Ligand binder design. Structure first.
Ligand SMILES: CCCCCCCCCCCCCCCCCC(=O)OC[C@H](CO[C@@H]1O[C@H](CO[C@H]2O[C@H](CO)[C@H](O)[C@H](O)[C@H]2O)[C@H](O)[C@H](O)[C@H]1O)OC(=O)CCCCCCCCCCCCCCCCC
Ligand code: CLA
Ligand code: CLA
Ligand code: CLA
Ligand SMILES: C=Cc1c(C)c2cc3nc(c4c5[nH]c(cc6nc(cc1[nH]2)C(C)=C6CC)c(C)c5C(=O)[C@@H]4C(=O)OC)[C@@H](CCC(=O)OC/C=C(\C)CCC[C@H](C)CCC[C@H](C)CCCC(C)C)[C@@H]3C
Ligand SMILES: CCCCCCCCCCCCCCCCCC(=O)OC[C@H](CO[C@@H]1O[C@H](CO)[C@H](O)[C@H](O)[C@H]1O)OC(=O)CCCCCCCCCCCCCCCCC
Ligand SMILES: CCCCCCCCCCCCCCCCCC(=O)OC[C@H](CO[C@@H]1O[C@H](CO)[C@H](O)[C@H](O)[C@H]1O)OC(=O)CCCCCCCCCCCCCCCCC
Ligand SMILES: CCCCCCCCCCCCCCCCCC(=O)OC[C@H](CO[C@@H]1O[C@H](CO)[C@H](O)[C@H](O)[C@H]1O)OC(=O)CCCCCCCCCCCCCCCCC
Ligand SMILES: CCCCCCCCCCCCCCCC(=O)OC[C@H](COP(=O)(O)OC[C@@H](O)CO)OC(=O)CCCCCCCCCCCCCCC
Ligand SMILES: CC1=C(/C=C/C(C)=C/C=C/C(C)=C/C=C/C=C(C)/C=C/C=C(C)/C=C/C2=C(C)CCCC2(C)C)C(C)(C)CCC1
Ligand SMILES: CC1=C(/C=C/C(C)=C/C=C/C(C)=C/C=C/C=C(C)/C=C/C=C(C)/C=C/C2=C(C)CCCC2(C)C)C(C)(C)CCC1
Ligand SMILES: [Fe+2]
Lengths: 34, 34, 31, 75, 34, 340, 37, 55, 29, 481, 55, 65, 41, 55, 41
């Protein structure tokens, strides 16, 4: 568990949150706009 | 449709001509002019 | 009002005006 | 709504004469105050060379690039 | 080599006169519609 | 189902098609364009190339560029959180991470665009030839901006995103690899010039064989999109071109397939050549001529003159092109011809 | 064993023949010198 | 400078070398040379071919 | 000796071009 | 009816004849392998494995045989230098002959399967038409391949019931085939750690076996079945092309950059060995330690093996040849005879000038002599009119240490220039330019050739995948809008 | 000879930095682009009047 | 058509064709596995690239012998 | 001077594909003539 | 472009256009182009020239 | 040792007549298939 590994896993989480916010936005609209 | 199209077209043309002219004046007075 | 268009258009236009203002200031910034 | 109808609308220009010039002035002040030099690390016209080094400040190492640049960009 | 010049001067004036008098022979009349 | 109505909204008919491919097309392409825009405006190349490449430093549109990272860094990804930068946006920009940012994001946006073409073709129910045609530019980008630097010492020798930087790349490859002599480049230029030829000749032939479908001199208004009959005489054009050139098309499908085929295969051949160059497997010398010139100082062709030009450009360009090598060439060492 | 129902024929126009001959000859012209070196 | 196939050239290196610099812009047809060998030595065929091609 | 090969290839290409103009498939309507 | 480029599509719905055609392809591949091995054995020279290794002679197939454990030959010699008495069947010749026999048998089987095409096995009882259950065939084949991978990893690499794999030193001086214990740690993913290969194969076996069992049991979902068109063989073709060019890119990358699976002694040094002065640094370190223990400089330099000095030569750089410079490296410089010894350049003030080595990009590089602080001291002037750094104006001498010219020194002007130009590119060696009529031009490794061919093949197969996947997806419309 | 002419033209004249050469490169690249795109669009939308085992 | 002995043995393997499970089946597991594979691949790529430094793993030539 | 193996490469690569294409065209024309009744069988 | 440059109206010359406060010159991408042009120029027609300028 | 022109003689004299004969046989079979109505045109 070096600095590089921590940064790598944190980057994985950043990718996760980006995909998650895109999906949340899609779900909100798609539903409120059948 | 209040403002005629060619009036806003002329205003935009004047603005873009101004901006581009400011660029050549610069090629001449300041950084990059030698 | 905020259709996808409004979005994409504003996301392309706001930085454009910001950068144009910045680039004009530069033309004066003289060594 | 088609573009031309929006462009010729008066209520459009009443929301595009307090937003566009303000943004332009903000972009001007971004570098008029000199913030852009610090944000991006680009050198000012008087920071290319210093009293100590009179040559190009190249990076030679990879995993110590941070410290090398910090030193080069001392003065 | 004067003979070679004579022969080429002929060929050239030959074909050039062919061109000049071919386009003088009522060319605009030569056409799909009449 | 939640997936179904999301898919329905993505394929909604609007001004611009979003589709599933949009999810990675729009952010990646937007980020690549923005990275190029900020790169040619604020960030510099002082610490990687010893140059000034930005509007802030006084470069115009023709000289500003997003330069490749420093050669000291190898083929690293230059991630903002990577060991080379460790956050700290300023040093990331200074060491040249913006080039990798732009390149990777643009490559993924390119993939997204090809997927978008596939999806549009599937939705409209037509054949996907457009994606196959677009495969050419994808191959060129991959071979030149990714494979070539990967085969070389580092990212430093990849082309930089700028107008003058691309010219430097052209001259560098000519000087160091004799790229003009490579047969794959010859195929590429043949394909590109033939594509331009085909475009111009087809446009002229169609526009000059129009039918009498109106009464005004302006022939543009004698056409309607929902038309069944043909607007130009295929027979007359075929006869004209067979009488002038000797061979002419007689099949519109074959004509347009040929128009598709020429530039794409030109680009593919050029990409194969570039992949070859990435490993220094270049078509540089003709051994027989090099010998026969070595054993006799009276033999000369344009080929040997090109070799002399390459040596001159290489020797005079290396010192400033590769500042990390610390090349120092005294005046008596540089090759120069006579008084000039 | 039996007559396969999947056997079709093969065709080639004269224009296709000319294109192929031209391609082969031009490729030979292009690469002959490089092969000779 | 050699540019012919029979003089140790290939398709790529071979060429029709343009006329001599001593001639410059002067017209150099065959009949102005004293011999055909001299005409070939000063690159007359280039002028012939190029003028005919343009016409 | 390769001059013979080059000449043969060029003349063969020219002959192929010749056959594609005067011995073409006649297109009929 | 069928255009020339569409001619092989008759075998699309004849499960039987497909097998026949795939068998024909397999026979051709095996026959090529055997014949190439025989040709290489015919033209091989197992005389000096030190200065004339396999990679120096243009051998392309021999390294792949020697990597997995084939070292002996029926001729009595061994690739590791020693001599073999009564090698078994598994020598180079035995492997080539086995491949040729496999090719012949596959040819016969292909003929049989083409003639007897109408087998009841390739029929659907429910419908009565030819059909293949692709999601089940995939499970069968994947289970088989996982079993094979596990067996190869556990038995033929760990040496439990196998010869092992080729394992070499960090500098390619002493390397030989030996069993490798697996490395079940973070270091297992170190590309240069040979235990990673055994660990990977065992784990990926035990993984693909379970995957195959899953695919044998569980049926596909309907959504995926409709989306991927899992009833059309062409989607299998496109996905397989995808995997194949992925693998080709990976292999080309690992060979170009080097790994435990591409040892130096088999394929030659990599491009990046020369850039960073790998072998030069090792040689300097060894000389420094030999001086530190206490010894004369001549005998300190004479203890450097010839192999190590031969690695530090630019003629062995894979990124140095040309595309159309055919033949092996020996055709480029000649067969290496012996090391000439390390030259030392000194000037009047007794400094230690070093010749700047040419980089890989350049094909012509000027001769420049610099001191310990990187300052020009001497050179060979291009225009000797106002030169102030000529080799004659600044007296420079050479003193060879540890080689054929060990203990010799030269003070003359032309000979110093000759040796400077020679030493501008790596170490100095003696070559035989008459055995093969070696011209004056460099050539490339099997490393470079493999990388080039496989990168181009991968680039083309990306396009192949694109076209075939597009054709699978648009099957119904692929005849006209 | 063509390559030599181009290189010497670059050295003595700076053709690349001339806006007309830029316009020509733009024209040629655009010609190839439009040719490929027009061909793809026309061939993709072709009325179904043939089988699959026929051009 | 031509039932062979082998064919008799291998018949059950090809017996079922076109059978399918309705309603997304086990797709989410495929998604999980694909994502974990992507994580593994980026881990390997960044280790090999020396962009991810881990103790006891030096990407350099080593002395196996 | 030049490599004496190119000769074979150039000549075979010119002749074999050319004869293959000529074969394809000849067999296409022969099948076309056979389909239509006439003096040719 | 070719016709205009035949009469020596060359492309843009942005050589040493960027200067720091002191006066030292900062190279741009155009200066490397000038470097390559110099390399080609001092080598073309090696024996033809006798005087410093190429007029 | 041996003449380097034989290679061309031997290889061309082996391949060209062989391809000529293969061509004759293929066109004969194609005409025969065309004459008889069937899936082949
Ligand atoms: C088709 C459409 C495709 C769709 C587009 C997809 C776009 C995605 C973007 C791709 C991102 C790729 C980045 C890979 C980084 C790279 O490669 O990074 C490079 C590293 C290898 O690292 C390099 O390794 C070299 C060899 O070093 C070795 O040798 C040295 C000896 O001195 C030292 O010992 C050193 O420690 C030791 O590692 C040097 O060290 C270099 O400095 C170092 O950069 O590989 C790696 O990360 C991974 C290497 C695995 C190979 C997979 C990449 C394939 C590239 C094939 C290239 C073949 C060559 C081109 C052929 C033409
Ligand atoms: C879909 C759009 C998209 C795509 C494809 C990319 C792609 C990329 N970006 Mg990126 N980016 C995007 C949107 C996108 N970006 C947006 C919107 C922003 C603005 C915030 C950025 C800002 C940005 C920056 C600032 C940088 C990048 C960089 C990169 C590159 C490297 C990324 C990387 O290694 O992380 C890969 C990340 C993942 C694969 C995560 C995926 C999600 C995982 C799989 C979820 C599950 C993980 C789970 C939680 C872990 C479990 C525990 C684990 C132990 C198993 C790559 C080409 C870097 C770069 O190019 O530097 C040169 C860089 O520095 N991006
Ligand atoms: C991508 C595949 C590939 C690669 C990288 C090489 C690489 C090489 N081949 Mg090779 N070769 C190949 C396929 C390949 N070959 C095939 C398919 C054939 C059959 C036609 C040959 C036939 C062949 C011959 C006959 C010779 C080579 C030779 C060589 C070397 C020059 C080099 C190591 C030469 C060499 O030095 O080998 C001893 C040589 O004489 N190859
Ligand atoms: C596993 C590899 C593989 C396989 C099994 C196939 C199989 C197929 N392809 Mg294909 N293809 C591939 C890779 C592959 N392809 C790749 C990589 C590309 C990109 C270049 C293509 C591009 C492609 C196109 C564009 C088309 C096909 C078509 C076809 C179908 C008919 C093939 C045919 O009639 O050829 C007949 C071939 C000949 C009569 C002679 C070809 C001779 C070639 C040009 C040179 C000789 C090769 C040599 C040896 C090669 C060495 C090897 C290492 C490559 C068939 C299903 C066609 C199709 O589906 O029709 C609708 C079609 O139109 N493919
Ligand atoms: C330099 C030449 C060149 C350019 C600039 C170009 C540009 C374009 N071609 C497109 C399409 C096409 N081009 C085609 C064939 C060809 N295109 C060719 C040559 C070019 N094509 C050639 C030679 C061919 C023949 C095969 C086809 C068949 C198509 C299309 O169907 C498509 C279209 O619809 O056109 C209207 C458009 C879609 C772009 C895109 O992916 O947007 C998405 C944005 C992305 C992917 C981000 C770009 C990221 C890039 C790679 C890196 C960043 C670069 C900076 C932003 C700019 C750097 C500038 C400096 C280098 C000076 C775009 C306008
Ligand atoms: C199935 C097991 C077959 C097996 O273990 O073969 C074991 C045999 C043993 O092969 C023996 O090997 C010896 C040197 O290793 C000598 O070469 C003997 O001649 C050879 O018979 O090897 C193979 O057949 C390899 C099988 C690859 C699968
Ligand atoms: C059936 C015939 C088919 C006819 C078509 C013929 C195609 C010929 C194309 C092959 C060109 C090779 C000729 C080279 C000229 C010459 O004589 O070389 C001659 C050389 C052999 O070299 C000779 O070797 C001798 C013994 O070692 C001596 O050393 C001689 O000095 C040396 O000249 O031949 C080759 O290099 C081997 C043939 C080519 C090998 C396969 C290509 C290399 C792999 C790259 C593949 C990647 C492709 C990716 C494409 C995408
Ligand atoms: C189209 C291709 C057709 C393919 C079929 C090819 C058939 C080939 C048969 C020709 C065999 C000649 C090869 C000789 C080997 C070689 O390389 O030679 C090579 C020699 C040339 O000799 C070379 O010449 C060079 C330049 O002078 C150098 O001197 C070389 O040293 C010398 O070897 O070729 C021949 O001798 C000429 C070709 C044969 C000449 C015609 C035959 C002689 C006339 C006798 C005809 C009477 C026939 C009566 C029959 C009843
Ligand atoms: C902690 C575990 C987190 C993930 C749990 C599985 C969630 C599956 C939700 C989705 C689900 O199972 O519901 C079913 C979902 C379809 O949703 P619908 O709303 O259409 O389904 C309606 C009903 O049929 C549901 O029964 O299937 C998908 O489309 C799967 C797409 C891939 C999904 C991949 C999810 C995994 C992503 C990576 C997770 C991180 C790495 C681990
Ligand atoms: C990178 C990055 C990022 C991003 C960013 C962005 C996204 C940006 C954008 C930006 C932009 C987006 C910008 C833009 C700009 C623009 C401009 C600057 C323009 C200009 C223009 C002009 C100049 C014009 C001209 C012309 C022409 C062209 C033609 C006609 C004429 C005229 C003159 C008009 C982030 C944050 C993530 C972070 C990380 C890094
Ligand atoms: C029947 C039989 C038999 C026999 C067999 C044999 C004898 C075999 C052989 C085989 C062989 C002997 C084979 C061969 C093969 C080869 C191949 C298959 C090749 C190929 C190649 C290629 C294809 C290439 C191509 C190319 C070129 C040309 C150029 C460059 C590029 C490339 C590389 C691509 C036996 C007795 C056993 C048993 C019984 C039965
Ligand atoms: Fe059209």
């Amino acid at each position: 568990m070096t600095a590089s590994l921590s940064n790598f896993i944190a980057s994985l989480i950043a990718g996760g949150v980006v995909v998650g916010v895109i999906a949340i936005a899609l779900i909100v609209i798609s539903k409120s706009d059948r | 449709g209040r403002v005629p199209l060619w009036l806003v077209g002329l205003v935009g043309g004047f603005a873009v001509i101004t901006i581009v002219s400011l660029f050549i004046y610069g090629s001449y007075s300041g950084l990059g002019s030698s | 009002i905020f259709t996808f268009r409004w979005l994409a258009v504003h996301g392309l236009a706001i930085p454009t005006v910001f950068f144009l203002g910045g680039i004009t200031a530069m033309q004066f910034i003289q060594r | 709504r088609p573009f031309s109808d929006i462009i010729t609308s008066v209520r459009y220009w009443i929301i595009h004469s307090i937003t566009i010039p303000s943004l332009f002035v903000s972009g001007w002040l971004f570098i008029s105050t000199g913030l852009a030099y610090d944000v991006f690390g680009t050198p000012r016209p008087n920071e290319y060379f210093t009293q100590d080094r009179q040559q190009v400040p190249l990076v030679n190492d990879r995993f110590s690039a941070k410290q090398e640049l910090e030193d080069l960009t001392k003065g | 080599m004067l003979t070679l010049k004579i022969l080429v001067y002929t060929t050239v004036i030959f074909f050039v006169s062919l061109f000049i008098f071919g386009f003088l022979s009522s060319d605009p009349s030569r056409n799909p519609n009449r | 189902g939640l997936f179904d109505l999301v898919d329905d909204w993505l394929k909604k008919d609007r001004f611009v098609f979003v589709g599933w491919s949009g999810l990675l097309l729009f952010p990646t392409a937007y980020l690549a364009a923005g990275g190029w825009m900020t790169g040619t405006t604020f960030v510099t190349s002082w610490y990687t190339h010893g140059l000034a490449s930005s509007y802030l430093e006084g470069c115009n549109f023709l000289t500003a560029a997003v330069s490749t990272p420093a050669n000291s860094v190898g083929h690293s990804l230059l991630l903002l959180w990577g060991p080379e930068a460790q956050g700290d946006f300023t040093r990331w920009c200074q060491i040249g991470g913006l080039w990798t940012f732009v390149a990777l994001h643009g490559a993924f946006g390119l993939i997204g665009f090809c997927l978008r073409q596939f999806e549009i073709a599937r939705l409209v129910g037509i054949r996907p030839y457009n994606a196959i045609a677009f495969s050419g530019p994808i191959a060129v980008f991959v071979s030149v901006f990714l494979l070539y630097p990967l085969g070389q010492a580092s990212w430093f020798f990849a082309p930089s995103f700028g107008v003058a930087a691309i010219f430097r790349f052209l001259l560098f490859l000519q000087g160091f690899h004799n790229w003009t002599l490579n047969p794959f480049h010859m195929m590429g230029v043949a394909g590109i010039l033939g594509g331009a030829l085909l475009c111009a000749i087809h446009g002229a032939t169609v526009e000059n064989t129009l039918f009498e479908d109106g009464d005004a001199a302006n022939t543009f208004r004698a056409f309607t999109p929902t038309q069944s009959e043909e607007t130009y005489s295929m027979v007359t054009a075929n006869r004209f071109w067979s009488q002038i050139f000797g061979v002419a098309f007689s099949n519109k499908r074959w004509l347009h397939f040929f128009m598709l085929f020429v530039p794409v295969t030109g680009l593919w051949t050029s990409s194969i050549g570039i992949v070859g160059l990435a490993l220094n497997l270049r078509a540089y010398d003709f051994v027989s001529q090099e010998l026969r010139a070595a054993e006799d100082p009276e033999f000369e062709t344009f080929y040997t003159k090109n070799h002399l030009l390459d040596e001159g450009i290489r020797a005079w360009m290396a010192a400033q092109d590769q500042p990390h090598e610390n090349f120092v060439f005294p005046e008596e060492v540089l090759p120069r011809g006579n008084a000039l | 064993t039996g007559p396969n129902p999947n056997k079709q024929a093969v065709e080639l126009n004269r224009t296709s023949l000319y294109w192929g001959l031209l391609l082969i000859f031009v490729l030979a012209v292009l690469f002959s010198s490089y092969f000779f070196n | 400078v050699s540019g012919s196939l029979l003089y140790g050239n290939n398709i790529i290196s071979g060429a029709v070398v343009p006329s001599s610099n001593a001639i410059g812009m002067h017209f150099y047809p065959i009949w102005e040379a004293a011999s055909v060998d001299e005409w070939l030595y000063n690159g007359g065929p280039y002028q012939l071919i190029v003028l005919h091609f343009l016409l | 000796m390769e001059a013979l090969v080059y000449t043969f290839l060029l003349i063969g290409t020219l002959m192929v071009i010749f056959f594609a103009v005067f011995f073409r498939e006649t297109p009929r309507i | 009816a069928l255009p020339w480029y569409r001619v092989h599509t008759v075998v699309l719905n004849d499960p039987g004849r497909l097998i026949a055609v795939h068998l024909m392809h397999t026979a051709l591949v095996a026959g090529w392998a055997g014949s190439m091995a025989l040709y290489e054995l015919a033209v091989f020279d197992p005389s000096d494995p030190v200065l004339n290794p396999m990679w120096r002679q243009g051998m392309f197939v021999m390294p792949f045989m020697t990597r997995l454990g084939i070292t002996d030959s029926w001729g009595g010699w061994s690739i590791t230098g020693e001599s073999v008495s009564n090698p078994g069947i598994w020598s180079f010749e035995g492997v080539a002959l086995s491949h040729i026999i496999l090719s012949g048998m596959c040819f016969l089987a292909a003929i049989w399967h083409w003639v007897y095409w109408d087998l009841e096995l390739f029929r659907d009882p429910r419908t009565g038409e030819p059909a293949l259950d692709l999601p089940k065939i995939f499970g069968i084949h994947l289970f088989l391949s996982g079993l094979l991978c596990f067996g190869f990893g556990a038995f033929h690499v760990t040496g439990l019931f196998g010869p092992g794999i080729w394992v070499s030193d960090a500098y390619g001086i002493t390397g030989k085939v030996q069993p490798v214990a697996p490395a079940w740690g973070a270091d297992g993913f170190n590309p240069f750690n040979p235990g990673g290969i055994a660990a990977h194969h065992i784990a990926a076996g035990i993984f693909g076996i379970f995957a195959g069992i899953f695919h044998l049991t569980v049926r596909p979902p309907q959504r995926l079945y409709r989306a991927l068109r899992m009833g059309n063989i062409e989607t299998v073709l496109s996905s397989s092309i995808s995997a194949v060019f992925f693998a080709a890119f990976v292999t080309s990358g690992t060979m170009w950059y080097g790994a435990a699976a591409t040892p130096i002694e088999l394929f030659g040094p990599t491009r990046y060995q020369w850039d960073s002065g790998y072998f030069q640094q090792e040689i300097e370190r060894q000389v420094e330690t030999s001086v530190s223990e206490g010894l004369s400089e001549s005998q300190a330099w004479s203890r450097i093996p010839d192999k190590l000095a031969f690695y530090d030569y630019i003629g062995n750089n894979p990124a140095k040849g040309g595309l159309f410079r055919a033949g092996p490296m020996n055709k480029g410089d000649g067969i290496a005879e012996a090391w000439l010894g390390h030259p030392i350049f000194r000037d009047k003030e007794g400094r230690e000038l070093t010749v700047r080595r040419m980089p890989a990009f350049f094909e012509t590089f000027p001769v420049i002599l610099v001191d310990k602080d990187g300052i020009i001291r001497a050179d060979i002037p291009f225009r000797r009119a106002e030169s102030k750094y000529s080799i004659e104006q600044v007296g420079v001498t050479v003193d060879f240490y540890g080689g054929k010219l060990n203990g010799q020194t030269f003070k003359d002007a032309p000979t110093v220039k000759k040796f400077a130009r020679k030493a501008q590119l790596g170490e100095v060696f003696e070559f035989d330019r008459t055995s093969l009529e070696s011209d004056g031009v460099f050539r490339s490794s099997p490393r470079g050739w493999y990388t080039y061919g496989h990168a181009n093949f991968a680039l083309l197969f990306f396009f192949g995948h694109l076209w075939h996947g597009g054709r699978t997806i648009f099957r119904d419309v692929f005849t006209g809008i | 000879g063509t390559f030599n002419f181009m290189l010497v033209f670059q050295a003595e004249h700076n053709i690349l930095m001339h806006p007309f050469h830029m316009a020509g490169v733009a024209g040629v690249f655009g010609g190839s682009l439009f040719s490929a795109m027009h061909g793809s669009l026309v061939t993709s939308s072709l009325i179904r009047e043939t089988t699959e085992n026929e051009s | 058509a031509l039932r062979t002995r082998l064919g008799e043995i291998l018949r059950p393997l090809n017996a079922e064709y076109g059978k399918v499970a309705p309603g997304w089946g086990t797709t989410p597991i495929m998604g999980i596995v694909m994502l974990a594979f992507l994580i593994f691949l980026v881990i390997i790529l960044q280790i090999y690239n020396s962009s991810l430094i881990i103790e006891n793993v030096d990407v350099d030539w080593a002395n196996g012998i | 001077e030049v490599q004496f193996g190119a000769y074979l490469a150039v000549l075979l690569g010119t002749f074999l594909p050319a004869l293959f294409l000529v074969n394809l065209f000849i067999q296409t024309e022969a099948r076309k003539a056979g389909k239509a009744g006439g003096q040719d069988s | 472009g070719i016709s205009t440059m035949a009469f020596n109206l060359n492309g843009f010359n942005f050589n040493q256009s960027v200067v720091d406060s002191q006066g030292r010159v900062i190279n741009t991408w155009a200066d490397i182009l000038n470097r390559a042009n110099l390399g080609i120029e001092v080598m073309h027609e090696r024996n033809a020239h006798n005087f410093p300028l190429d007029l």
